[PDB]
Design an enzyme around this catalytic site. Structure first.
Site, PDB file in Angstrom:
ATOM      1  N   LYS A  17       0.826  -1.202   0.000  1.00  0.00           N
ATOM      2  CA  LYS A  17       0.000   0.000   0.000  1.00  0.00           C
ATOM      3  C   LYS A  17       0.865   1.258   0.000  1.00  0.00           C
ATOM      4  O   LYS A  17       0.496   2.277  -0.583  1.00  0.00           O
ATOM      5  CB  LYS A  17      -0.941   0.007   1.206  1.00  0.00           C
ATOM      6  N   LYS A  36      12.990  -0.284  -1.586  1.00  0.00           N
ATOM      7  CA  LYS A  36      11.570   0.009  -1.392  1.00  0.00           C
ATOM      8  C   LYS A  36      11.223   1.423  -1.851  1.00  0.00           C
ATOM      9  O   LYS A  36      11.833   2.397  -1.409  1.00  0.00           O
ATOM     10  CB  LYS A  36      11.179  -0.172   0.078  1.00  0.00           C
ATOM     11  N   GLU A  85      18.571  -4.367   3.106  1.00  0.00           N
ATOM     12  CA  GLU A  85      19.256  -5.624   2.835  1.00  0.00           C
ATOM     13  C   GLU A  85      18.348  -6.515   1.994  1.00  0.00           C
ATOM     14  O   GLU A  85      17.125  -6.384   2.044  1.00  0.00           O
ATOM     15  CB  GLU A  85      19.644  -6.329   4.138  1.00  0.00           C
ATOM     16  N   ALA A  87      16.913 -10.290   1.099  1.00  0.00           N
ATOM     17  CA  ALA A  87      16.708 -11.614   1.677  1.00  0.00           C
ATOM     18  C   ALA A  87      16.491 -12.648   0.578  1.00  0.00           C
ATOM     19  O   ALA A  87      15.388 -12.766   0.040  1.00  0.00           O
ATOM     20  CB  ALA A  87      15.533 -11.600   2.640  1.00  0.00           C
ATOM     21  N   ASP A 130       4.233  -4.573  15.347  1.00  0.00           N
ATOM     22  CA  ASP A 130       3.672  -5.123  14.118  1.00  0.00           C
ATOM     23  C   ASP A 130       4.402  -6.383  13.660  1.00  0.00           C
ATOM     24  O   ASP A 130       4.897  -6.450  12.535  1.00  0.00           O
ATOM     25  CB  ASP A 130       3.709  -4.075  13.004  1.00  0.00           C
ATOM     26  N   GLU A 134       4.403 -11.416   7.270  1.00  0.00           N
ATOM     27  CA  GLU A 134       4.678 -10.567   6.116  1.00  0.00           C
ATOM     28  C   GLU A 134       5.911  -9.699   6.343  1.00  0.00           C
ATOM     29  O   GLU A 134       6.462  -9.131   5.399  1.00  0.00           O
ATOM     30  CB  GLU A 134       3.465  -9.692   5.798  1.00  0.00           C
ATOM     31  N   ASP A 148      10.089  -5.001   8.532  1.00  0.00           N
ATOM     32  CA  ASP A 148       9.328  -3.761   8.667  1.00  0.00           C
ATOM     33  C   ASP A 148       9.355  -3.194  10.085  1.00  0.00           C
ATOM     34  O   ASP A 148       9.233  -3.927  11.064  1.00  0.00           O
ATOM     35  CB  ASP A 148       7.879  -3.980   8.227  1.00  0.00           C
TER      36      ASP A 148
HETATM   37  C1  6F2 Z   1       9.751 -12.048  -2.463  1.00  0.00           C
HETATM   38  C2  6F2 Z   1      11.142 -12.629  -2.613  1.00  0.00           C
HETATM   39  N1  6F2 Z   1      11.438 -13.754  -3.308  1.00  0.00           N
HETATM   40  N2  6F2 Z   1      12.774 -13.982  -3.237  1.00  0.00           N
HETATM   41  C3  6F2 Z   1      13.478 -15.085  -3.848  1.00  0.00           C
HETATM   42  C4  6F2 Z   1      13.339 -13.013  -2.502  1.00  0.00           C
HETATM   43  C5  6F2 Z   1      12.331 -12.130  -2.085  1.00  0.00           C
HETATM   44  C6  6F2 Z   1      12.551 -10.974  -1.289  1.00  0.00           C
HETATM   45  N3  6F2 Z   1      11.633 -10.106  -0.797  1.00  0.00           N
HETATM   46  C7  6F2 Z   1      12.295  -9.115  -0.070  1.00  0.00           C
HETATM   47  C8  6F2 Z   1      11.835  -7.971   0.648  1.00  0.00           C
HETATM   48  C9  6F2 Z   1      10.454  -7.683   0.714  1.00  0.00           C
HETATM   49  C10 6F2 Z   1       9.739  -7.230   1.808  1.00  0.00           C
HETATM   50  N4  6F2 Z   1       8.428  -7.096   1.424  1.00  0.00           N
HETATM   51  N5  6F2 Z   1       8.306  -7.458   0.131  1.00  0.00           N
HETATM   52  C11 6F2 Z   1       7.039  -7.478  -0.669  1.00  0.00           C
HETATM   53  C12 6F2 Z   1       6.218  -8.645  -0.157  1.00  0.00           C
HETATM   54  C13 6F2 Z   1       5.678  -8.612   1.119  1.00  0.00           C
HETATM   55  C14 6F2 Z   1       4.925  -9.700   1.586  1.00  0.00           C
HETATM   56  C15 6F2 Z   1       4.733 -10.826   0.771  1.00  0.00           C
HETATM   57  C16 6F2 Z   1       5.286 -10.861  -0.502  1.00  0.00           C
HETATM   58  C17 6F2 Z   1       5.095 -12.076  -1.411  1.00  0.00           C
HETATM   59  O1  6F2 Z   1       5.993 -12.891  -1.457  1.00  0.00           O
HETATM   60  N6  6F2 Z   1       3.902 -12.271  -2.206  1.00  0.00           N
HETATM   61  C18 6F2 Z   1       3.746 -13.356  -3.030  1.00  0.00           C
HETATM   62  C19 6F2 Z   1       2.394 -14.037  -2.876  1.00  0.00           C
HETATM   63  N7  6F2 Z   1       1.336 -13.128  -2.994  1.00  0.00           N
HETATM   64  C20 6F2 Z   1       0.245 -13.691  -2.868  1.00  0.00           C
HETATM   65  C21 6F2 Z   1       1.484 -12.076  -2.083  1.00  0.00           C
HETATM   66  C22 6F2 Z   1       2.847 -11.400  -2.227  1.00  0.00           C
HETATM   67  C23 6F2 Z   1       6.033  -9.772  -0.969  1.00  0.00           C
HETATM   68  C24 6F2 Z   1       9.517  -7.831  -0.334  1.00  0.00           C
HETATM   69  C25 6F2 Z   1      12.805  -7.166   1.280  1.00  0.00           C
HETATM   70 CL1  6F2 Z   1      12.385  -5.745   2.189  1.00  0.00          CL
HETATM   71  C26 6F2 Z   1      14.170  -7.513   1.181  1.00  0.00           C
HETATM   72  N8  6F2 Z   1      14.571  -8.593   0.497  1.00  0.00           N
HETATM   73  C27 6F2 Z   1      13.645  -9.407  -0.136  1.00  0.00           C
HETATM   74  N9  6F2 Z   1      13.784 -10.559  -0.890  1.00  0.00           N
END
Ligand code: 6F2
Length: 253
Positions: A17, A36, A85, A87, A130, A134, A148
Site C-alpha cells: 500500500k 523500497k 538488505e 533476503a 507489528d 509478512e 518492517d
Molecule cells: C519475495 C522474494 N522472493 N525472493 C526469492 C526473494 C524475495 C525478497 N523479498 C524481499 C523484501 C520484501 C519485503 N516485502 N516485500 C514485498 C512482499 C511482502 C509480503 C509478501 C510478498 C510475497 O511474497 N507475495 C507473493 C504471494 N502473494 C500472494 C502475495 C505477495 C512480498 C519484499 C525485502 Cl524488504 C528484502 N529482500 C527481499 N527478498
C-alpha cells in the site's frame, strides 16, 4: 548522499500500500539489495512521516543477524527510496502458503531466532508491535530476519495485535510476547488463533482470548502458546523464559 541513478532496478519483489519493493544493484560496487519505493504524495494523505522517520531512525543503527539491515536512504521529488538488505530466500509468508504448515523443528527454530532479535530490540527500549509473517524474511542460510519497522516506537489488521493495544490501553514490551505467541500458533496450524471474517468479530476474539487447538498440536506447544497468550500483560513470560522453554529447547536448533 545517495541518488536514484546509482542503482539498476530489476525484479519486483512485491507490492504494498505504501509502495513496491524492487530488487536492485548498486552500479559501482555491484552490490545486491532491496529497494523500497514510496510515493511522497500518498505519504501525505496518510500522514505518517513521523513513523517513516522513526522506522528509518530505529532500524538504521540496529545491528543484529536476525534483523534486516537498513543501509541508507534518499529521495527524488516524486517519491522516497529506502535501501534495505536483500533476503535471498524470500518471506516466511509465502513460505507458509507453500508448505501450509510448519513442523515443530522449523517453528521452534523460528521462534528462537525471533526471541533473540526481540531480546536485542527490547534491550534498547524498542517495541516492534507489528510482528507478522509478512515482515519476516529469510537469509542465505535460511535464518529469520525481521524487516518492517513502520509501527516501531519506544516504551488496521488486528490478527496479531494484543488485547491492551486494540482496546486503546497502555501497551509495553509485552505486546511482542503476545505477537510471538500468535505467530507460533500460525506456524503450527496455518492460520492465526483469532482469525475471522470481520474486524468487529476478531476484536471480540482477541479481547476475550478465545482460541482452540486442533488435535495434531502437541502438549509442548499448547503450553508455550497458552503462556504467551495471557490477557494479563504481566502474566506473560520473559524472552529468557521463552528461549529456555522445554518444547523450544527440544525442537529448536
Ligand atoms: C519475495 C522474494 N522472493 N525472493 C526469492 C526473494 C524475495 C525478497 N523479498 C524481499 C523484501 C520484501 C519485503 N516485502 N516485500 C514485498 C512482499 C511482502 C509480503 C509478501 C510478498 C510475497 O511474497 N507475495 C507473493 C504471494 N502473494 C500472494 C502475495 C505477495 C512480498 C519484499 C525485502 Cl524488504 C528484502 N529482500 C527481499 N527478498
Amino acid at each position: 548522499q545517495w541518488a536514484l541513478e546509482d542503482f539498476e532496478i530489476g525484479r519486483p519483489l512485491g507490492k504494498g500500500k505504501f509502495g513496491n519493493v524492487y530488487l536492485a544493484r548498486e552500479k559501482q560496487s555491484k552490490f545486491i539489495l532491496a529497494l523500497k519505493v514510496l510515493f511522497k504524495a500518498q505519504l501525505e494523505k496518510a500522514g505518517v512521516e513521523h513513523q517513516l522517520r522513526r522506522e528509518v531512525e530505529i532500524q538504521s543503527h540496529l545491528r543484529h543477524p536476525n534483523i534486516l539491515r537498513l543501509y541508507g536512504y534518499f529521495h527524488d521529488a516524486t517519491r522516497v527510496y529506502l535501501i534495505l538488505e536483500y533476503a535471498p530466500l524470500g518471506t516466511v509468508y509465502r513460505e507458509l502458503q507453500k508448505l501450509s504448515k510448519f513442523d515443530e523443528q522449523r517453528t521452534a527454530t523460528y521462534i528462537t531466532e525471533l526471541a533473540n532479535a526481540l531480546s536485542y530490540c527490547h534491550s534498547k527500549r524498542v517495541i516492534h508491535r507489528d510482528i507478522k509473517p509478512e515482515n519476516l524474511l529469510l537469509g542465505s542460510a535460511g535464518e529469520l530476519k525481521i524487516a518492517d519497522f513502520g509501527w516501531s516506537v519506544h516504551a488496521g489488521t488486528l490478527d496479531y495485535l494484543p488485547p491492551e493495544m486494540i482496546e486503546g490501553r497502555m501497551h509495553d514490551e509485552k505486546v511482542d510476547l503476545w505477537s510471538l505467541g500468535v505467530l507460533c500458533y500460525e506456524f503450527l496450524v496455518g492460520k492465526p488463533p483469532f482469525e475471522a471474517n470481520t474486524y468487529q468479530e476478531t476484536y471480540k476474539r482477541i479481547s476475550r482470548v478465545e482460541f482452540t487447538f486442533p488435535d495434531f498440536v502437541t502438549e509442548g506447544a499448547r503450553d508455550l502458546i497458552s503462556r504467551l497468550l495471557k490477557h494479563n500483560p504481566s502474566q506473560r513470560p520473559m524472552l529468557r523464559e521463552v528461549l529456555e522453554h522445554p518444547w523450544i529447547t527440544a525442537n529448536s536448533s
